[PDB]
Structures are given as structure tokens and as C-alpha cells.
Amino acid sequence: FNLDVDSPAEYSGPEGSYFGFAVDFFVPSASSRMFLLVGAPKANTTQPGIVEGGQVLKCDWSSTRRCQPIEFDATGNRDYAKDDPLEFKSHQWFGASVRSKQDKILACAPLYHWRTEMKQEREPVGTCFLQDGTKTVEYAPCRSQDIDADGQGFCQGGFSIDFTKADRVLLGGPGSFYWQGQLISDQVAEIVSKYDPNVYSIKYNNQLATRTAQAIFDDSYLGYSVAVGDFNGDGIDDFVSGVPRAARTLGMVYIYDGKNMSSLYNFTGEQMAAYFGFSVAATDINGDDYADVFIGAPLFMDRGSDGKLQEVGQVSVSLQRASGDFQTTKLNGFEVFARFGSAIAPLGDLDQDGFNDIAIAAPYGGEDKKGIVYIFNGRSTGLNAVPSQILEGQWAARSMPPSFGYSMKGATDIDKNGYPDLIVGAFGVDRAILYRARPVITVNAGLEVYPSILNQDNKTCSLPGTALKVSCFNVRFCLKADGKGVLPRKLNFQVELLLDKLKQKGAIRRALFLYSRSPSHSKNMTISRGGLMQCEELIAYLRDESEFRDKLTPITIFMEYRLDYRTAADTTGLQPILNQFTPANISRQAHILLDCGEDNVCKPKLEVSVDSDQKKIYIGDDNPLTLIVKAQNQGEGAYEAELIVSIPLQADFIGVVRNNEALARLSCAFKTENQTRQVVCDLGNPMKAGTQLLAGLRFSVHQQSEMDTSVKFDLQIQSSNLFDKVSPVVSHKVDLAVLAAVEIRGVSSPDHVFLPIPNWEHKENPETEEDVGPVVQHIYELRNNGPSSFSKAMLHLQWPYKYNNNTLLYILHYDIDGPMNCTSDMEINPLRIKISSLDIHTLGCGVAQCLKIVCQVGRLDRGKSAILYVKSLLWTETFMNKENQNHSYSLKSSASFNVIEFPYKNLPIEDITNSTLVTTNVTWGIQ
Amino acid sequence: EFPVSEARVLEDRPLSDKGSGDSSQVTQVSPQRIALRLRPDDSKNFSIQVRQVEDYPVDIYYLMDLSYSMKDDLWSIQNLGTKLATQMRKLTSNLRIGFGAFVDKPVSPYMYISPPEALENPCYDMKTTCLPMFGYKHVLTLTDQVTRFNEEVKKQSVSRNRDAPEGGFDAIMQATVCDEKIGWRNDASHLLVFTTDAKTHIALDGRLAGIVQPNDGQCHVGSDNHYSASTTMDYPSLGLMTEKLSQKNINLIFAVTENVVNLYQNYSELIPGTTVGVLSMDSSNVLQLIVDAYGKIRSKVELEVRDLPEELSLSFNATCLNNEVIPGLKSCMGLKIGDTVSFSIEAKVRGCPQEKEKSFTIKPVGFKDSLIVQVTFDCDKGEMCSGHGQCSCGDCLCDSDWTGYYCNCTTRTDTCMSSNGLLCSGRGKCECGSCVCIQPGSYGDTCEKCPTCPDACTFKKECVECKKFDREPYMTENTCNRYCRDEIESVKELKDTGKDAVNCTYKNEDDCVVRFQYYEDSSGKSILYVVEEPECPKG
């Protein structure tokens, strides 16, 4: 959460060299010291005829701030023939990608063009350069015999690089094949022990590589970004690469096997053209040793307050479960247009608390697009989504945006002190800056006053001037601090005490220190050890009865304290910082004796009570619950009184109750300090005798499914008096209940079919629907809207199959959506009919002979339904337009259901049942 | 007291369906300017009227994909322009026409790299010679002679690119932020026809080509009419395109080929006001596409707010059809050109800040006309007031774009927008950025789903039984037009063949059996072919 911004290390490069475009740390194994690795993709060189071949510079941390290049290669363009070059190094953007290990550093030139040896070309295949002290070898996995766009001609391998712990390089060439991309992992030494300066190809033995995919995958850009970590099983680092253009410009991130190179996982973007994949990064952000995936889509447009789309960016934070699944969350940017997941750079453990950190970057943020960097800390839960600090660029634009934060790197402890560090790179001004992490101290203060309950008529000490005895009380204040790093020995502090803080500018300061009659005393002690809490003490008196009126507004003593510089380490006084979540204020309370008759002790009688109003809450929705408490004091004084309501994992306190003339508006507040959630309420500091209170605490119970049958609360008041300080813990439980409004809607596609029947021929034997009739379609829908869900139910449909041996509405087949399987007592579609190929009224069951479909349901939650789609065919014998009243029939269909089972067995579940019908009226229309 | 005013300061009135405006400076939004004066936590109601002024001067620019594939699209288009005027004349007394073409950034990855130098000039691979890459060139600004368009479009030759996606977004930009060059004029309906038959490069794609300087949104064409930073500056983002589009009041129409249509459609859904249309293979279709999109642009009054102090918030209520009101909305669709709509705006500050002119805007999208609001303020342990979640203090007063006691509620209707556009599919109402269905047996995020709901044959009948029969409801609420649109037709004797639609049948008031059909293909068609000659009882 904190690192020096006062005095960071500034580094520079040539105007337009793009210095600071690729940053990294150099930690040789052969030396005690460490360095900076900064790429200058556009820097000119002394290589014959090479304009802006670019470079890489090793910068000194030894406070010299001098960076001289690194001799990767100084030769010009190699030949193939006379005035026919073989390759073209000018404008190769060498330095655009930089990574290293111990002595081993890989730097590439993704804009390196190569004239194929077959035809005269200029293809951006790209090459790298792996140096190791003296031995320097060119690594160009993409410079193969297979060329042109269709192959690896435009691979630009070196776009993104990275090493695995087992010393193996992962490379990214976006333009491979048809710009789909490609990954190539080659183990070093196989890269080193295979280099032959006389071959522009070189096959590597244990090489791993992704293959050409279908045409549809073209232009995806796999290799745009790369990060590495262990996801798949155990062993080594697996490959992670961002495919910013995958899908439909949606984006996708691929995870590959660290050895097979087979696809493990995949990630897809939510909003297209957002560049979901521009940057990737894997780190265990929550100390459970599991690499977590972070993905940046700097152009994501989130919905702003007003509802309008706004480009601000977003970071996909996928946390790795033990099962191999993910608990992926989301994190949006703060300003519009400043890109955000443009650069995710995982830091070590800045604060060093056993949880890793990470620094997301908005290169074009701040004022005048000077960009800012946000450092987000980790925790057992996941990543603390709130920035713990923001690093702001300080450089103005030269000819284009400074781009501060475009490329950043932090994880190695470049300096002495025990915490990591960070390198950021503003290349629009050609710079790199070293932000040194500062020492973190955790401090523990203590404040305790001797007589706690002040007595006016006590004769103990004596005033400074006059030796007049006065009512005494002592006050001491211990202080203990110890940090985890390079800092101790002299943690000096400035402490400040305060008597009667509650007393504003009104001036009725009921208490004063001894020898210096004033409520404000100043001091400055010291310490260092983690258990040697040096403690200072004092003496304070109380003013005589005839100087003020109090009425017992507790004399609260206050304590403050703070660090100081010249506690820092030699190399530019690296001043420490107190932990973020540690208060510099501690304050206790005093109480003039009053009404605590004769034993001098104020021993009360406390009692709570809750009426059990509204005995039920249903399972499924949020159940509003108000509690009516009756807290009172039947004993004497109750110093610092308070109600302690204990609540479960799904309680959640809303607020008090104002919307009532009978209830009180207590100073209730929610709290969890321990592995416990609970509500507290001020019952008035000195909760006077006979003081009766009756208020309302509302909640909103979330369910948690089965999980037993009732929910307890534990009420109790607790005070500061040495005797009878607490009330009997009164427990209160409310019972869970089951409610599931289930219903059955039905409908008919052609609800009305007019019998004059346009175009129809009476066939000897039907073969198609057209030979039969129209398509009358019934649809029944079983839906559960109730809070509680059910586990099983029964559905019964009765079909008006035929009347007197004669068919009417021959079902072809039926379809189901949701949790249900069906079965017809009769075979549906006996006459094997297929698609195109080229009494007085009411009918249905009861009158006609049924064909029944019985369906087994099971699993309809709070807002889920089950649908049955019956597809009929009006069998056109509904004719008989000759003799009587063939004039009109109404084909009735009716389905019913019975919810037979629920997931809760504990609660008294009753059966839900109901029915409905569906008609298809076939009338004569014209006549 | 010290009352809060709302004094209208300038009241130019709508120019009733008169687009040519004889020095009448043509108004389209009535209350041109007002000046309210708020006090602490006080509000003030007012309103604004805006009409789709008939005969509004159009402007049309022709941005086309000049990739080798759109060679045949240059054939059946060299005649166009002249062919366009006869259509647009029926729509405007004045019309400017224009042209300009794109290909892709003339650099390494996209362009034909540099194998033989014999390529910097053409596309030598077949034997035919075309043209070198160019990115974006402006030829023929916006002029009157619909023939001049034909003269230039004849002089146009196609080019050839290596990469699949073209870099036409750079063009959409330059052809929006370069007002003078193109010749976009003030009081005139603006239209940018973006024709393309292939994918496109988005922003950041330029990293490969070595471009790390992002788009600035400024004009970069020079006297030579070629986009200069084409090679020095990366593609424009959906946000920045979207930004400059609204500021210059341009309407982006995507005339795109079938293969790539669904694409530019989701690209359409991120740039509101974008119209997509299925261009033909030989792009002859470009017209009954253009003269179509125009109808779409002028069938909705969306209200946009430029600026506005964070301190105060506006609340809108759009009344559009027969003065029935629609609360919580600043947009009306389904309109015909000439109609007028009214929105009743409100304003309130949460405790007045410090004096300043503070003058903001409220205007329809695409319209030059706007309502200028100058605001002035007549000013001269813990806190249980909470519950959190936007709730402030004193006693709890939510922020702008928030409502309700606890402050859970929202003003946003976008979460209630639908597939079709109508709020909550027409079956329900938006309540705190979330539909609550007036359940005819329906459910869904926007109430889209309704299995047990009556078939279309029942929904559409309502239409035919009026648009062709002058009776039933719709006739009764005067809504059998904007509400029940589509397109009816009295189909000769029997009906249609294409079995990609439903055939309906019904008995009407007069005891006769009406027979229709609901179709829907091409560009979202919706004909209702009505078999004329209903079967009725004889005598």
C-alpha cells in the first residue's frame, strides 16, 4: 500500500528512442548488485546502415543513474547476393520486448524483416537475441523455410516473451499463418547449444509450438500478450496468451500445457473491440499458492451513472479454484479514455504481509494524459478492489502522450530494504522511474486510567502551588511497535494526551494533569522491540465541585501518536510508514461517582426481551424482519451501556426504526471484529436507573436453502461496571417456511380454425400434413414464481384424441423445455405422417376417448418454468356437413399438475395442485 | 421568500413542416433558450418541444471500400448519384452529395510490404495493374451536381491490400472531424454512408504495424486530400468515434455485405444511432438502402445532454402519442417526418454550490437545434441518517440519477430497453432500471418471453382490422399508425407462397372471414398480405 513517491529514481533516453517501452529488472547470479533493463525500440545505432535498429540499456541502481546500452549485436545487414540484402535491421523495434533471468536476458526485434531465400521479399518474421555475459545467440523460431503470410512470413515473433522457472522461453508471434498467431516454447541451451551462425533456420529438438488452425480463426492475434503460471495439475508453468481479436473482436485468452502445448483453458470477452487480451498476468494474489489470471481490455465501455456507454477499461480477475475452475470477478477503470488494464504488473508483496500485490495502469489518465498507476493489494478473500495508492506521471507531452505506465515491472527488491520495487515506463518522454517500496511498521498503543470512577470527595494528592489535597487519578500509556524489514532500532514517537475530549470549545474541562494544570499534555517517547512496550505514566486531578456542572458526561482521555524521519536507511532516507489499517487514536472514559449509593459501586440490573412478532420467513426471497427489543436498567448506573444483537450469516442489519412514534432511535451500528457478526446500540452512556427502552431493529433475511429450520439471534446488554455488568443472554429464533406459487398456463396456436377449410382433398390414405389438415398447436407451461423452489412434481395432460372411432387432432409429436420427461399412453404419430415433402359443442376428454401424456417434473426454482409443446393436426373429418349440427365443435384439452416433493424436509411442506384447459374451436364461418 | 425562476429567455417556435425556411432560420426545437434560478435543494419543472421538420436539407457522403473486391460495386455505382437525386428530391428541396474512399494504412503489415519494388505501384500477381495503397482519400466534397458525383466515381479505380480487415475506421473519423473539407452544413440532416464488404481494423491493431500513438480525433487531411497520420496514428476507438459522431451530428450508416453483416450489427449496438443495411454483391442496392435509413434516422427523437453541473439532476417524461404520457424517458420512436413531440424536463440541485454562469445544453441527437439552460443559484461517533448506497446526510438525499428512500432506485431505462426497442417489450414497465411485467402470462429481463401468449394472428388482426377496415380499437385510440405500423397490402385473390410466414384467418364485425399473412425477410421486412375479397354470406 506504500512506496516512496517523494524521491523515486528517474532515468532517461534519447528523444524518440521510445526509452522505457519495455522495462525489466536485471539480477545477475554472478554479482552482489542489481540493474535496470530498459528498451529503446527507436534508438539509432552504430550498426552499418541501420536506422533505429533500437536497443536495450542496462541502467545503474547505484545512484549514478547512468545507462549504457548492451552489446547484443553490432553488425549491419547480412547478404544473399551482391546488392541484394538478406535481412533489414533498420526500424526493427529491437527492445520492444525484454525479459531476463540470472545473467540470461532475451531481447527481440518484432519488426525485423527478412527477404526469403526463395523470392525477393521483406517479411516481418522478427528475431530475438539471447545474451549471457559473453555468449550471444540469435533466436528466431519464426525464420523457417515455410514462408509468406500463409506461413510464418508475418509472424513478428518476439512481440511478447517470457521465461518459465525451468528456464524455458515462451514466445508470441501474432501474424503467424493468417494472423491467427502462435506460441513457441524452446528450452534455453537448446537455443544456446544449437546456434550455428551459418544457418538461418535451425530446428530446435524439444521445441513446442501451436499449429495452423482453420481459416475462420485468421486475424485473431494470438501472441499479442504472454504470461506464465502453473494451472494444469502440478509441475511447471503453463502458457497464457491474450488473443485480443479472437471471436468477433470479442477477445479470448488461451491457457496451454507447459509440455504438451495442448489447450487447457479459455477466456472470452464480454464486449467486442475492447481488446480483451492486450495484457495478461498470472500471480497468486491470495496466498494459497495458485496462480490467478488477470486480463486487460483497456477499451471496455462500462455503463456510467446516466446509463451512457463510456470507454474506461476493465480488468478480468480470474481466481483459481482447487478444482481447476475459476471465481472470476471484474474491475473497471476510473477515468474515461485513460486506458486501464493496459498494463497489469504484479508486484511482489509491497507491504509484505504474506499476500501478493499488483499494479494496473492507466497510461493516459491524470491531468493532461500524464497517466497514473494504481497499486491493488491482495487478501485471503481475493483482491481488495480499491486502489491502495496511485502513482501519477509528472511529465508533459513532447510530441505525443508521455504514456506513463504503458510498460511497468516490479517484483525484485532492487535495494537493501526487505520490500519489492517497481519500474514504470513513460516512453512518450523516454523515461523509466524507480519506485522504492518503504518499510512498514505496525504499532500497538495502550491507554488506561487508574481510578476509573472518579470520586469528588476524595483527598489524595496536592496542587503544584498550594499543597491542597485534591481528587486524584493516574493515567499511563504503553506503546509497542515492530516491523518486518530493514528499519528498527529507533522507532521514535510523538504522543499527545487529552483530558475530557467530549468537551468542545465550550471550555468546561472537568479534568487537568498535575504539575501542569491543563487538559493538554505533550510528550515524545521511544521503542523498537516487538514486545518491549515502553510505558509512560502521569497523574491527573479533578476540579472541585464548585467549578463546574457535569451530570456525568464521562471524562474521556485521548491518545494520539506518530512517526518521524531519521529512522530511515542510509541510501536516501527511506522513511517508513505505519500500517494502513491501524488507528493513531485510542481513548478511554472516566466517571465521576454519582448515585452509586454507599457501596460506591454502581451495580445494575439489565434485561432484554423480544416479542417474536411475525413467526415466519419464507425460503427464496428476501424476508424483511423487524425486531422489537425491550432493554432496561433496574439497577443503578450502567456506564457505557450497549445492546449486543448476534446475527447469522444471512441476517444483514438495515437500520433502526424512525417510522414509529412508539419506538426509539438508538445509535445502533453494524460490526464484525471477530469471527462474529453483530449489531451494537448505545443505550445511553450512563444508562440511568429504571431507564426503559423499546426499539425496532429491522433486517432482511437471505435464505441459505435447507440449512435447518429456524434462525437464532442472541440479545444481551453489557456495560463497564465491575459488578453485574451484563444482562442475561436472551436468544430469539424465527421459523423458516415453504412457499411456492406454482401455476399452469395453456394456449392454442390457431385457437380458431374455420372449417370451410380452404383447399383440401380427401385422400385414401394420408402421407403428409397437407393431406390431413391445419396445424393446431397446444402449449402448457408449468411455472414456479413462489419464493421457495420444489424438487419434483407431476403433470397430466388429457388429449381429445377421437370421438366415436373417428379421429380429431392427431398429435404428430411433442417438445419439452426445462426439467421434464413425458410419456403418452398411446403411440404419437402412428400413421407415420411427415412434414411438407415437396356433443352439441364441447368435446375433449370426458366425451371423447383420451390419449394422455403424463410428465415427470422436477427442479423448478423461484423463477423457472417447464413447457410442453403439443403439435397436432385437425383431422378434417370434423366435416359431416350434411345432416344435423355439424355446425360447431369445441375440442377441449386439459392438463393438471401436483407438486409432490421439495428439497427441505425439515419444514411442513404441503402439496400444490391445480389445472387448466385449452380449446380449439372449429366452426363453419360463412355457411 | 426568494422563489426559484425558470424564465424562458428566447422562444423561437417550430417551423411547421417548412424545411426550406425563407430566411426564417428554420427552428426544430421550440424553447431555444431558458434561464432557471434554483435555491437550496429546490427544483423547477419546464419543458421542450421538438418536431421532425418536413423538407429538411439533406447531406450525404459516400465512404466506400475501394478494395479490389469492390470493383464491380464501382460499375453499378458510377451511374448513381444522379439516380439518387430523383428519390431524395421527393424528400428535400435541397440536397448535397459527396464521396470519399478508404483502403488501409499504407504501411508494412497491411500494405503489400515491398517484395518487388514492382509492387509499390500495383498488384502484379494477376497481370492486371490496379493502384497503390492509400488509406483514406477525399475526392469530390459535398456538392449539388449529382452528375459531378458521376464524373469522379468514373475516375475512381480500385486498389489491393494484403490483410483481411480494412482500415476504414480511420476514414469514418476523418470524414466526420474534417467539416470544411467535406462540406457538412449547419441546418441540414447529416448522413455518412459507410459501404464495405469485409472486416475492419479496430484500435490497437496498429501496434503490430509499429503504431503506438493513439487517435486524437482531429482533422488530418491536407491540401492533397489524403489522411496524413494514417501511418503515424493508430485506429480510432469505438468511444472516440462515438464521441465525435454526436458532436458533429453525423449519422453512421453501415452499408455492408451479407458475410460481414452480423458483425457491423454488434458494432452498431455499441455506437447508438448507427444504422446497418445489407448491401448487395454488386452494390446496386445502395439507395433503396440509403433512402430507407433516412426514414429510420427521422423516426426517433432521442434527447442528449451536453455538459451539466454534477450538482443538479434532470428528470424526463416523454409524451408522444395523443398526449398520453410516458414517465421516465427522454426518447420517442416510431415517428413519421413532420410530427412534434414534447418532453417535460425537471431540475434540482442538492444544496446550491458557488455562482457561475453554468449554462448547459439539452438537444435531440442529430439536430443542430438545442435548448440552452443557464443556471444560477439563490444561496446568499457517526450519523444514522444513513443506510448507505448513494444515501447522503441530514436525513438521506440520494445523488443524481438515483431515487428512493434508501436510494436503491435508478433513472436508467437502458436496462429496460428491448430487442425491438420498446421499453419492456410492450408487455411491462421499467421500475428502477428493471422491468416488472404487466403479465399476460409473460416474464423475462425485459418481459420478452411469453409462451402462453396469443399467436401473432391475434396481434396483427388488430392492425388489418383498421388499416384496411377503419374499425376496432386503434381507430378508437387513434393509435393505428405509430403503434400498429408494418405494411399491409391487399393481395390479389389468393395469397403468398413463401412458407417463411404465418397465414391467418378470422371473422370480422360483419360476419365475414378475413384471411392474411405475416412475412419478414430482406432487411427486416413485415408485410401483411391481405386476401382481398373476404368470404361473406351470399344471397
Ligand SMILES: *[C@@H]1O[C@H](CO)[C@@H](O[C@@H]2O[C@H](CO)[C@@H](O)[C@H](O)[C@H]2NC(C)=O)[C@H](O)[C@H]1NC(C)=O
Ligand atoms: C535516427 O537517425 C535518423 C537519420 O539520421 C533520423 O531520421 C531519419 O533521417 C531524417 C532525420 O529526421 C528523416 O527525415 C528521415 O525520414 C529518417 N529516416 C527514416 C528511414 O525514417 C531519426 O530521427 C533518428 N532517430 C532517433 C531516435 O534519434
Ligand SMILES: *[C@@H]1O[C@H](CO)[C@@H](O[C@@H]2O[C@H](CO)[C@@H](O)[C@H](O)[C@H]2NC(C)=O)[C@H](O)[C@H]1NC(C)=O
Ligand atoms: C479455446 O479456443 C480455441 C479456438 O477457438 C479452441 O480450439 C479449437 O478446437 C477445435 C476442436 O476440434 C479445433 O478443430 C480447432 O483447430 C481449434 N482452434 C484453435 C485456434 O486452436 C479450444 O478448444 C477452446 N477451448 C479449449 C479449452 O481449448
Ligand SMILES: *[C@@H]1O[C@H](CO)[C@@H](O[C@@H]2O[C@H](CO)[C@@H](O)[C@H](O)[C@H]2NC(C)=O)[C@H](O)[C@H]1NC(C)=O
Ligand atoms: C484521531 O481520530 C480519528 C482516528 O480514529 C481521525 O478522524 C477520522 O476518523 C475516522 C474513523 O472512522 C477515519 O475514517 C478518518 O480517516 C479520520 N479523519 C482523518 C482526516 O484522518 C482523526 O484524524 C485522528 N486525529 C489524529 C491527530 O490522529
Ligand SMILES: *[C@@H]1O[C@H](CO)[C@@H](O[C@@H]2O[C@H](CO)[C@@H](O)[C@H](O)[C@H]2NC(C)=O)[C@H](O)[C@H]1NC(C)=O
Ligand atoms: C372456444 O369456445 C368456447 C365456448 O364455445 C369458449 O369458452 C367459453 O365459452 C362460453 C360460451 O358462451 C363463454 O361464455 C365464455 O366466456 C368462454 N370462455 C372464455 C374464456 O372466453 C372459448 O373461449 C373458445 N376458445 C377459443 C380458443 O376460441
Ligand SMILES: *[C@@H]1O[C@H](CO)[C@@H](O[C@H]2O[C@H](CO)[C@@H](O)[C@H](O)[C@H]2NC(C)=O)[C@H](O)[C@H]1NC(C)=O
Ligand atoms: C388455481 O389457480 C389459482 C391458484 O394458483 C387460483 O385461481 C382461482 O382464483 C381466482 C378466482 O377468482 C382466479 O385466479 C382463477 O380464475 C380461479 N380459478 C378457479 C378454477 O377457481 C385457484 O385457487 C387455484 N386452484 C387451486 C385448487 O389451488
Ligand SMILES: *[C@@H]1O[C@H](CO)[C@@H](O[C@H]2O[C@H](CO)[C@@H](O)[C@H](O)[C@H]2NC(C)=O)[C@H](O)[C@H]1NC(C)=O
Ligand atoms: C431497496 O429496494 C428494495 C426493493 O424492494 C426495498 O426492499 C424490499 O425488499 C423486498 C424485495 O426485495 C420486499 O419484499 C420488501 O417489502 C422490501 N423490504 C424493505 C425492508 O423495504 C427497499 O426499498 C430497499 N431494500 C433495503 C434492504 O433497504
Ligand SMILES: *[C@@H]1O[C@H](CO)[C@@H](O[C@H]2O[C@H](CO)[C@@H](O)[C@H](O)[C@H]2NC(C)=O)[C@H](O)[C@H]1NC(C)=O
Ligand atoms: C398458407 O401457407 C403458405 C404461405 O406461407 C402457402 O403456401 C404457399 O407455398 C406453397 C408451396 O410453394 C404453394 O403450394 C401454395 O400455393 C402457396 N400459397 C399460395 C396462396 O399460393 C399456403 O398455400 C397458404 N394457404 C393457402 C390455403 O393458400
Ligand SMILES: *[C@@H]1O[C@H](CO)[C@@H](O)[C@H](O)[C@H]1NC(C)=O
Ligand atoms: C498431455 O498428454 C496428452 C496431450 O498431449 C493428454 O492426453 C494428457 O492429458 C496431457 N496431460 C498429461 C498430464 O499428460
Ligand SMILES: *[C@@H]1O[C@H](CO)[C@@H](O)[C@H](O)[C@H]1NC(C)=O
Ligand atoms: C482517591 O482518588 C480517587 C478519585 O478518582 C478515589 O476514587 C480513590 O478513592 C482514591 N484513589 C485511589 C487510587 O485509590
Ligand SMILES: *[C@@H]1O[C@H](CO)[C@@H](O)[C@H](O)[C@H]1NC(C)=O
Ligand atoms: C452480433 O449479433 C449476434 C446475434 O445476431 C450475436 O451473437 C453477437 O453479438 C454478434 N454475432 C456475430 C456473428 O457477429
Ligand SMILES: *[C@@H]1O[C@H](CO)[C@@H](O)[C@H](O)[C@H]1NC(C)=O
Ligand atoms: C414526471 O412525471 C410527471 C409527468 O409530467 C410529472 O409528475 C412530472 O413532470 C415528473 N415528475 C415529477 C415528480 O415532477
Ligand SMILES: [Mn+2]
Ligand atoms: Mn503445469
Ligand SMILES: [Mn+2]
Ligand atoms: Mn491463488
Ligand SMILES: [Mn+2]
Ligand atoms: Mn500484499
Ligand SMILES: [Mn+2]
Ligand atoms: Mn526495496
Ligand SMILES: [Mn+2]
Ligand atoms: Mn451501589
